[PDB]
């Protein structure tokens, strides 16, 4: 029932967190996408750290009913432009493949990651 289109990573934001003893920088990937209704379109942006992509896969894998669907979906594993580009490409295709499976795209896990619900 959720219709997601045109999902891509458009850039990054380098932010900061407190470790408890000081501040540390970290990287968010900016993911933009649209949702369709029937003829309305909503624009969406969510910023997620690499670790958040990895946690998403883990949440799905923790659940047998969902894990089955993503057996063959290549996901993340726990400047050098070629590597940055390969990472952006990997993460993008990961999300797109997840969204293309109704049972996964509509899961609470993907919805939360994408800030849809």
UniProtKB/Swiss-Prot annotation:
This is Sorting nexin-19. Plays a role in intracellular vesicle trafficking and exocytosis. May play a role in maintaining insulin-containing dense core vesicles in pancreatic beta-cells and in preventing their degradation. May play a role in insulin secretion. Interacts with membranes containing phosphatidylinositol 3-phosphate (PtdIns(3P)). Belongs to the sorting nexin family. It is found in: Early endosome membrane; Cytoplasmic vesicle membrane. It comes from Mus musculus. The PX domain mediates specific binding to membranes enriched in phosphatidylinositol 3-phosphate (PtdIns(P3)). Interacts with PTPRN. The lineage of its organism: Eukaryota, Metazoa, Chordata, Craniata, Vertebrata. The gene is Snx19. Signal peptide: none annotated. A 1,2-diacyl-sn-glycero-3-phospho-(1D-myo-inositol-3-phosphate) binds at residues 49, 87. Changing residue 87 to K: Abolishes interaction with membranes enriched in phosphatidylinositol 3-phosphate. Abolishes location on endosome membranes. Residues 7-117 form the PX domain. Transmembrane segments: none annotated.
């Amino acid at each position: 029932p959720v219709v997601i289109q045109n999902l891509r990573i458009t850039g990054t934001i380098t932010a900061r967190e407190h470790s408890g003893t000081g501040f540390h920088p970290y990287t968010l990937y900016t993911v933009k996408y649209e949702t369709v209704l029937n003829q309305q379109l909503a624009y969406h942006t969510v910023n997620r750290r690499y670790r958040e992509f990895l946690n998403l896969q883990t949440r799905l894998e923790e659940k047998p009913d969902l894990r089955k669907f993503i057996k063959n979906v290549k996901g993340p594993k726990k400047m050098d432009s070629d590597r940055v580009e390969a990472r952006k490409s990997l993460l993008e295709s990961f999300l797109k493949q997840l969204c293309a499976i109704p049972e996964i795209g509509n899961s609470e896990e993907v919805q939360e990651f994408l800030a849809l619900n």
